[PDB]
């Protein structure tokens, strides 16, 4: 299965990509997760990415999809893969398009996970994640078993450096552009899938199981 | 790990800095301390910086980002670095930033000590150093255990030449109209942090120490 998970900041990407993956095997590429790699390795690449990250803008296209082209490239997708956070605009997606169409793995559906933008900035100012796995968590909607650790490692939780009231708020506002014009190009397309995200996290994943479920 | 402190004038980078050298590791490069090795050494850039710290002027920016670019390519930084008092001019600023694009060694956080500037005189006047390690001390807010010697190696303690009113002042006078540009321009670069420095120095460092989880 070829999938793309699409949301605006906060909405539940990371969290259902985590249950989609261990259920279904695909590889699970957050080009945010990307970024972030490479700005901790500080490579070329995340010297780049930074200084739009930082500030909640956009990375430009050309390195974006450029990053993206060639993670699909790689062998553990040949079953299928679990984009997530990108595309996120209508140039992306259509770069995409003719990425895939060359791989020979068109997009099977787009899950949108819809969450009112006004409940946005709760979920990431109270974000902890974990600076060993990467897992998350929410210090009200789903906190660790031990304060500032992680369950799965007892690795130590951090705040995500974009996660401050003034870039979240930036990502919200570029994002939010960026939304209705992608979710437009996948309903002409007809694969667009729409699920309610502001629920809770089981019940979100369910409806994405009854989907998934029909593409093995 | 890569980071940088600022603050006015005895705000406590000094104080701070030794907490976060001794949990992480990282060197603490002080231009400060430089310039005044440098003096008591007699070196060319001691002398020639002497002038400007004695009357508590800033020494000059070329020289000063001279000897910081060559700090910081020393092995010592590969895992990140702990910058202080430096920079505290725009110029400076966007020197670093090309220094450490070209050392792909970008800031991570600019940590800004706030400290009201009307009881900055007190700290300063009242500060007596190791002349062995350099550790500071404060006749009142935080006295050696016997007075005139250092608690860990017994050495006499002093107090430094420009802690004196009149350069005091003159510090004070400098550096503060070099602060809000300074907070600006990092601002503008998306990783100013802001922290209350005005409390016990562990609920300080307890602030500081909250920013640096996730930090390779
Ligand atoms: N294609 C692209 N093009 C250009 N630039 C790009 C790009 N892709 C990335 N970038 C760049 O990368 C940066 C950010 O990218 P990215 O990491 O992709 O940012 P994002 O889209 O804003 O998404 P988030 O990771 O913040 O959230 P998420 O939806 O995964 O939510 P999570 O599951 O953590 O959940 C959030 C919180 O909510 C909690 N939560 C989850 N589900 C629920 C639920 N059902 N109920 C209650 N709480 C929940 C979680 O525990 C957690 O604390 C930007 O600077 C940007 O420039
Ligand atoms: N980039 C650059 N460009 C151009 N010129 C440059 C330059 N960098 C340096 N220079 C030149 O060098 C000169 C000196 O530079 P520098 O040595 O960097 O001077 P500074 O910026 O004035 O800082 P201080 O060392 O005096 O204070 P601090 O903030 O470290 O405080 P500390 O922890 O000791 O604390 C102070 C006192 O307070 C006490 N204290 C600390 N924390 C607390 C607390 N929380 N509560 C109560 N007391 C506390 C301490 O015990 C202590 O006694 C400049 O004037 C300039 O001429
Ligand atoms: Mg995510
Ligand atoms: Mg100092
Ligand atoms: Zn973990
Ligand atoms: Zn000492």
Redesign the interface.
């Given at each position: 299965m070829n999938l793309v998970l699409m949301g605006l900041p906060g909405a539940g990407k990371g969290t259902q990509g985590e249950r989609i993956v261990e259920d279904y095997g695909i590889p699970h590429i957050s080009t945010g997760d990307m970024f972030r790699a490479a700005?901790?390795e500080?490579?070329?690449l995340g010297?780049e990415a930074?200084?739009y990250i930082?500030?909640?803008e956009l990375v430009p296209d050309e390195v974006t999809i450029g990053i993206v082209k060639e993670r699909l490239g790689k062998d553990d997708c040949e079953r299928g893969f679990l984009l997530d956070g990108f595309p996120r605009t209508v140039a992306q997606a259509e770069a995409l398009e003719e990425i895939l169409e060359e791989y020979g793995k068109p997009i099977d559906y787009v899950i949108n996970i819809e969450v009112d933008k006004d409940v946005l900035m709760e979920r990431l100012t109270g974000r902890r994640?974990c600076?060993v796995c990467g897992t998350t968590y929410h210090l009200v909607f789903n906190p660790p078993k031990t304060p500032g650790i992680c369950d799965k490692d007892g690795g130590?939780?951090?705040?995500?450096?974009?996660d401050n009231e003034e870039?979240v708020s930036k990502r919200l506002e570029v994002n939010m552009k960026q939304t209705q014009p992608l979710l437009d190009f996948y309903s002409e397309k007809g694969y667009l899938v729409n699920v309610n995200g502001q629920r809770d996290i089981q019940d979100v994943y369910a409806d994405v199981k009854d989907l998934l479920g029909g593409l093995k």
């Open positions: 700005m901790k500080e490579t070329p010297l930074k200084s930082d500030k909640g994640i600076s130590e939780l951090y705040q995500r450096a974009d870039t």
